[PDB]
Amino acid sequence: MMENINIVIKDVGYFQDKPQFLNSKSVRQWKHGTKVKLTKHNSHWYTGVVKDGNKSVRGYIYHSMAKVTSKNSDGSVNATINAHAFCWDNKKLNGGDFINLKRGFKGITHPASDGFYPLYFASRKKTFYIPRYMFDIKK
């Protein structure tokens, strides 16, 4: 009756509709190496705009997922996406103890009705949590 799930962390950076990992939707999940234009938003986040049809839509991406290669006169930057995910030691998904999970990280979790997928790390004596949108389940 108890079940395990094999997961693989996605090969993407997360361009979210808000500068937060909790209660945000992906505007883009940009493949590792995608080239983009961004503006620094705060100490930890970039923002930018993309087109969904005729509409300009704003997103936010965490600073470690964007490598700045050049600076534009208007204060924007040209950047390459560095794909990785996170797990957190609590369900706020914001600071505290968090681990950078490498793109393609292979893990095991369990069905989570609340969408906070538990990761038990042997070397740690603590549960970390990863949201559904940061991984795939292999078919």
Automatic annotation (TrEMBL):
Domain of life of the organism encoding this protein: Viruses
Tell me the residue numbers annotated for binding N-acetyl-D-glucosamine: W45, Y62, W88, G95
Q: What is this protein called?
A: PlyP35
Q: What is the lineage of its organism?
A: Viruses, Duplodnaviria, Heunggongvirae, Uroviricota, Caudoviricetes
The gene coding this protein: ply
